[PDB]
Each structure stands twice: as C-alpha cells, then as structure tokens.
Amino acid sequence: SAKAISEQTGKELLYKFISTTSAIQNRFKYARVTPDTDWARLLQDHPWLLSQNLVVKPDQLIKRRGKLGLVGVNLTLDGVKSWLKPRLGQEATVGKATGFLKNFLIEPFVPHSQAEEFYVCIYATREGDYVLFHAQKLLVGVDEKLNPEDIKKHLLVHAPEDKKEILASFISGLFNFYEDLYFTYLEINPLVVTKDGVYVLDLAAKVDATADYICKVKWGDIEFPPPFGREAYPEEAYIADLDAKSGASLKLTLLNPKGRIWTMVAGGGASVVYSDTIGDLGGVNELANYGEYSGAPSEQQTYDYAKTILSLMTREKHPDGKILIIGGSIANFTNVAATFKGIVRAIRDYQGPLKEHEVTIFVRRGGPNYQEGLRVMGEVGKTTGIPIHVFGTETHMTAIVGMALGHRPIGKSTTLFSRHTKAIVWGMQTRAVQGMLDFDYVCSRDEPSVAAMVYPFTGDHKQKFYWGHKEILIPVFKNMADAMRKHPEVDVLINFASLRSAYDSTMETMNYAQIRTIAIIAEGIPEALTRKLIKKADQKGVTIIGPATVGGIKPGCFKIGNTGGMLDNILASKLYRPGSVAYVSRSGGMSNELNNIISRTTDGVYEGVAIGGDRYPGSTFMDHVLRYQDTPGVKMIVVLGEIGGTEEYKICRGIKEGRLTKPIVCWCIGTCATMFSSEVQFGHAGACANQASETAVAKNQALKEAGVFVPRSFDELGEIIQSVYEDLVANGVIVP
C-alpha cells in the first residue's frame, strides 16, 4: 500500500537525498513542536528561530491549512508561542474528522512575490509518472528518464527564460528523488523560486511502503502517520512487525478502541465484506477495528495476531458486553485448523478477561481442514464457558453479522487454459503441485498439468508425486533455461517466488516466448516494479495473472497453484467439470466463495480468475470480461469489484459500445468506506479511493445504470446470480 508521510519527514528526505545543482534554501531549517517540546533545546538546536520571522502550521496530514486558518504567517518567535497557546492541545475539525492539534512545524518566513510561487506535483499511474507544473502535464513512461530538456519544452513553455534553468534542474532532481525513494505522490504547493533560489514551502507525499526492503537505508526509521481524526496505537505497530517477518499478510487498523464490535476475519476481501455488512446494519459507530490475516499464517503467527485483538477488546467494560466476529471466506490455502488452533490458544489464555467483559464469539469459516478448525473452536467454548456460535460453509459468509447485531446478546489471448495446459512451477511447492495433480486427476485429464519445476537453489533432481493412486516423477531444474528447452509444450508458468525475487524471475520467464501466461503469486511487490512487469508483458503479449493473488481456476482443465484448495472443496463446489458462469475478482479468498456460491445457484463455474489486490494488476477486470465475452462456452459473467480505481467503469463503456452483450452480474465491495469520519485503507494495497467516483457505492450505481445486474448488497449476490441463470435456462441459452 501507498502511505502518506508527514511534511517534515518528506522535507527531511528531500533535504538529505535530492541530487541537484540548484540552490535549495532553508534546508534543515525546521523545528517540530509538540506538547512535550523542550523549548530551550529547541532554540539551542534551531538558533535561526530567534533571528528571523517564522511560519507555524500543524503537520498532521491536514490539507488546505491556509483556507482553514491553521497557519500563523510572518510571526516572531514570541508571536509563534502565542499563536500556539490557544491551538496546541485543542480539538479541531476538518470536514468529517475531529482530532487534537498536537504536532506543529516551524519554518522561516519567505518573503516572495505572488508570481514567484509555482505548483509542482508528481504522482504515479499504471502507464508511468505524471509531472504537473503551473496547468502543464508531462508523462514519464515506465523505465524512461526525464530529460531536463523535456521539462523545458513541455512544462516551462509559459515560463520566463531566466527562471527556466533553475526550474528544470530542480524538477529533474525532484523527479529522480521521487523515483529513487519509491514515492507514488509528491506535491509542492507552493514552490517558491526567487533570486536567491528554491524554497519548499509545503510538501505532501506518499511512498510505496512495500519498497521498505529496497529503501531501508535512505528512509531510515520512517514514520507513516494516521489520517487526521484518528490516533496511532502500539498494537498496530506490533502487528505490522509480525507482517514484516512473515510471507503471510497481517494487518490491523484501530477505528474505535472502545467500540463493542470486534472482527478477526481472514482475507483482505472478506474482511471488507464483513465491514460492509456491519456498516449496513448501523454498527459503524461501534466497529472497533479493521484488519485481516491471509496467505496461510502459522499457528504461532495467528496466536500472536489473535491475542492482540483479545487484549485490545478487554481494556474496559461495555454495559451490553462485546461481540467478536471470527469470519472468512472458504479459504483456498490458509490452514483453518492450524490458524484456528492459534486463535483458540489465544482465547484460552484470555478466557478470564473474555468472560469478565461478556464477550460473545461468532465464527464462520471454510477451507483446508475447516472441520477440525470449527471443532476445536467449539471445544474451547465448552471448556471455557465462553459463548461461541460456530458455523460452516452451509452458512452464508456474512450471516453471523446479522446474528451478532440484530440484538445485543442477553487485446491478448482469449483462451489461457485447457485440458492440455502444461505449466512450469517456479519455487519449491510440492503441496501446491500435488493439489493441482489431484484436481487434474478428478477432472479426468490425460496427463498432469505440471510438466516441470524450477528452483535455482537446489540442483537438478526428480520429485515424487501421486497421479491418482499411482506415483510419478516430475523433473526439477536449477536453471530455467534447461526447463524451457526440454519442455516447449509448456505455455504457463506459476511463479511462487518471494516478493524479493519475484521481479527478476518473472522478467526472466518473459525471455521465453513459449510461455504465454504467467501467474505471479507473491504479495508485496513494489508497484513500480510491477509496472515494469506490465510493460514487458504488454510488449511480449504475455498474459499476467497477479501479483498478490492465489491465481484462478478453470474447472475440468487447470487450476493455478493453491486455488480451489483440497479435493473436498473441488468436489463440493463441482469444480471438476465446467459450467456456464465465468467470474473475475480481486480477492483470492472471495473467489473461492464465488466458486461455492456459483456452484449452488448455476450449472457451475466455467472459468474463474483472481486478478489480485495490488494497485496495478497484470491483467484487469476488463481484460478477463472481454475474454469471457469472446468465449462461447461462457453465458454469464460475475464481477466482484472493489473500491479504488476506475476499472469497473470500463465495463460500463463496453456495454454502451456493444462490445459486451452477455449478462453481467457485478458487486463492488467497500461500501462502508464512506461511512467513516477518517479515511481507512483496506487489506489490498489498491483498495484506496481518492475521488467520489472510485467509491464502491458510486461504481455500483454506475454499473446498475448501464445494464449490469447489481444486487443491493453482497448478501443478495447469490440471489441475483441464480436469477440471471434461470432466465438463461428458460430462454434456452443454457442447457445443463
């Protein structure tokens, strides 16, 4: 996810690391003011405070501080102390948000003309980074460079020739700094340029937090502050530390520490849906947290996550007690037994405080070993006396929310996969490959879908597998070149590389034209690298599914890695033979919920794809919707959209232009995001809305107006899918 940084942090980074021949005035002339400031030290460390006039403002992610009257301008140091006395430690309201003014930044006042102020902004898109100046707009493409002469010719057309060389030089330095330190947004408004040089009067910025492993040295102990209106809490940092030390995903944001509605949901998608449901039932004001765990965390990691929740919800008593919602989709991959054993351990260690605080627990879960998981979850309820109501896959995912709240407890290729698909798997993933072979067998495939594996940290060798009951060998290669030249029949590669090596291994794969489809599994790739992956993929005509995805499945033909889980899920959801329903979602866990939902209301899934949660997926919703339009076996299309970006609108335009004619059912998750006083970023790195059009509510209305079938909520998604299906059956379009 991209995260905002304070103005001081951004100016800190800029003063230290901008590489420019321009003169940047007042570098390191700032002073941070908190209620705990030692004002004697402050004057000692920043003596310029006493010898020139100053500017004071809060540094707490509040924009338009001028229009809000939150900027003392051209004051002496004594005037600053006085300007601060009514304001420091006092509440303030910016739009919907209310919070304490507690962090201020003092800087020298810069006498300047109105004409010496300039606007500069750099922000990232899929196609590269745009540079704004004034409004002049220039696109720097992926893997391109910003020629200072390109700045002079497009940005500085209406600029005086004398100021033209310091502006181009500063912007060139600012852009390289922007790129080197993995910024995604950098705004200076105003940038003051006088005869003495360049002044950075204001700075707002966001950096790609996933690039920590690349930028550690220069970022230092970088601080990502909460949005104005909310506070930061030590438990969030603790969980974020668990997230860094694990390939699994672990996230937690506190919304209301005193609220009585607590969630511990698996999956970035599912956790947004439970929050949406809670919001629809009036519980937003009592919603204590948003968070998720996914990517198959261990028993121990899940215990550490769960115990943070249980401690946070036993800090004080609520007269009506409290409720804990332990939900999730039917997981593809996460071990339900292993993770619920960890939650059970936490519940056990906190059973005293939980009974003391009158906590009622509601559980809904499916996935690998979910029967054991639900059993041990009911066992701990009986031995502790804690009321725990447990439900399985038979129960609608969000049903436990209503139970808990209804009262207070008393164009690229059309076809990617076929029965004949042969794939290379990058990484050591015996369990994933075996899960694919089991699926291939019950699908009545002639041959295994995995022809070879590649892992450059071991030598060439064979690997035993089970094909049905018989045992077989699949070659494992150290060098990708060897696997490719010996298996020209392979056209799919499923990349299980970690986030650190996924970039290079995927770029290497695209040197082999025989590979037409690449699934990138890893979550946490920096967005700027994925853009380079997208650029090369587009140049080579290679379809990329991912990153940050479990993959997808084509019943009867092929399934990417862990998608679809164990045989018992393959059989229950009828994923061993195709139906007429195709779907695409961002969430991998929710995609398996759709497998189950579609299995129960139609003839079954024809093909399903999870494009991943990252901001720039290798393939988009529209890309796969188009494939389904052009696939005759597909008769209806289901899209599980999400807040953030404008991708779903391309579906609207496609209908309006006659390109898309088959029935489309779509629901966009994230409707509760607009109910909050502050912004909240969900589990998926791309689930962030800037404009009103990027909200799930706005997209749902737009989709519905264009002829898409949109349910009222996620709860009715299964209803409207069954209803569209039966029409097609009645009209003869589908014959089971």
Dihedral of the alpha carbons of 340, 345, 350, 355, in degrees to the nearest 10: 60
For the chain, how are helix, strand and coil distributed in percent, rounded to 5? Answer: 35, 25, 40
Angle at 141 between CA 140 and CA 147, to 5 degrees: 45
CA-CA-CA-CA torsion sign (692, 696, 702, 705) = negative
Q: Which of residues 9 and 246 has its CB atom nearest to Na ion in the complex?
A: 246
Q: Which residues are annotated as a binding site for citrate?
A: 295, 332, 334, 350, 365
CA 178 – CA 170 distance, rounded (Å): 12
**Segment near Na ion (CB under 5 A), from 61-69, 237-245, 407-415, 583-591?**
237-245
Does residue 35 have a cis peptide bond before it, meaning omega lies within 30 degrees of 0? Answer: no
Q: Which residues are annotated as a binding site for CoA?
A: 703-713
Does residue 547 have a cis peptide bond before it, meaning omega lies within 30 degrees of 0? Answer: yes
Residues 244-273 as x/- pattern, contact with Na ion by CB under 5 A: --x---------------------------
Question: Which residue has the CB atom at the shortest distance from Na ion?
Answer: 243
Q: Which of residues 297 and 565 has its CB atom nearest to Na ion in the complex?
A: 297
Q: Are 588 and 549 in contact (CB under 8 A)?
A: yes
* Minimum CB–partner distance for residue 213 and Na ion (Å): 11
Both tokens assigned to 228: 């104005």
* Minimum CB–partner distance for residue 523 and Na ion (Å): 7
Q: Say which residues have a Cβ less than 8 Å from residue 483's Cβ, sequence separation at least 6.
A: 424, 452, 453, 454, 475, 477, 490
The pairing of strands 322-326 and 289-294 is unpaired
Could you confirm whether 684 is annotated as catalytic? yes
* Minimum CB–partner distance for residue 613 and Na ion (Å): 13
* Minimum CB–partner distance for residue 292 and Na ion (Å): 11
Q: Which of residues 246 and 393 has its CB atom nearest to Na ion in the complex?
A: 246
Q: Say which residues have a Cβ less than 8 Å from residue 252's Cβ, sequence separation at least 6.
A: 235, 236, 239, 240, 289, 290, 291, 305, 308, 309
Both tokens assigned to 242: 């668990």
Measured CA to CA in angstroms, residue 699 lies from 333, 536, 617, 643, 691 at distances of: 30, 30, 19, 8, 11
* Minimum CB–partner distance for residue 684 and Na ion (Å): 13
* Minimum CB–partner distance for residue 246 and Na ion (Å): 5
Q: How many residues does the chain have?
A: 736
Q: Which of residues 240 and 567 has its CB atom nearest to Na ion in the complex?
A: 240
Q: Which of residues 246 and 335 has its CB atom nearest to Na ion in the complex?
A: 246
* Minimum CB–partner distance for residue 249 and Na ion (Å): 5
Q: Which residues are annotated as a binding site for ATP?
A: 57, 65-66, 108, 110, 117, 202
Q: Which of residues 522 and 560 has its CB atom nearest to Na ion in the complex?
A: 522
* Minimum CB–partner distance for residue 252 and Na ion (Å): 12
135 three-state secondary structure = coil
Whose tokens are 């601060």? That residue is: 84
Q: Which of residues 246 and 619 has its CB atom nearest to Na ion in the complex?
A: 246
Burial of 3 from C-beta contacts in 10 A (0-12 / 13-18 / 19+): middle
Helix residue ranges, H only, 399-555:
399-405, 430-442, 480-486, 502-509, 527-540
**Segment near Na ion (CB under 5 A), from 47-55, 187-195, 239-247, 712-720?**
239-247
- In this chain, which of 208, 243, 614, 647 binds Na ion, going by CB under 5 A? 243
The rounded Cα 722 to chain-centroid distance in angstroms is 30
How many residues bind Na ion (CB under 5 A)? The answer is 2
Q: How many CB atoms lie within 10 A of CB 575?
A: 30
**Segment near Na ion (CB under 5 A), from 241-249, 267-275, 404-412, 418-426?**
241-249
Q: Which of residues 173 and 268 has its CB atom nearest to Na ion in the complex?
A: 268
CA 401 – CA 261 distance, rounded (Å): 10
Site membership for Na ion, residue 292 (CB under 5 A): no
* Minimum CB–partner distance for residue 645 and Na ion (Å): 23
Q: Are 272 and 682 in contact (CB under 8 A)?
A: yes
* Minimum CB–partner distance for residue 417 and Na ion (Å): 29
Q: Are 442 and 570 in contact (CB under 8 A)?
A: yes
Q: Name the nearest CA neighbour of 432 among 563, 330, 570.
A: 563
CA 521 – CA 108 distance, rounded (Å): 49
Q: Which of residues 243 and 491 has its CB atom nearest to Na ion in the complex?
A: 243
Q: Which of residues 573 and 681 has its CB atom nearest to Na ion in the complex?
A: 681
Burial of 206 from C-beta contacts in 10 A (0-12 / 13-18 / 19+): buried
Which DSSP letter does residue 448 get? -
**Segment near Na ion (CB under 5 A), from 29-37, 240-248, 676-684, 687-695?**
240-248
Both tokens assigned to 509: 């794969």
* Minimum CB–partner distance for residue 524 and Na ion (Å): 6
Q: Which residues are annotated as a binding site?
A: 57, 65-66, 108, 110, 117, 202, 243, 246, 248, 295, 332, 334, 350, 365, 703-713
Q: Which residues are annotated as a binding site for Mg(2+)?
A: 243, 246, 248
Q: How far apart are the first and last CA of the chain?
A: 44
The one catalytic residue among 154, 461, 469, 684: 684
Measured CA to CA in angstroms, residue 181 lies from 88, 174, 248, 528, 534 at distances of: 33, 11, 25, 11, 21
Q: Name the nearest CA neighbour of 400 among 283, 253, 566.
A: 283
How many Cα atoms sit within 13 Å of 321 on the Cβ side? 18
Residues making contact with Na ion (CB under 5 A): 243, 246
By annotation, the residues acting in catalysis are: 684
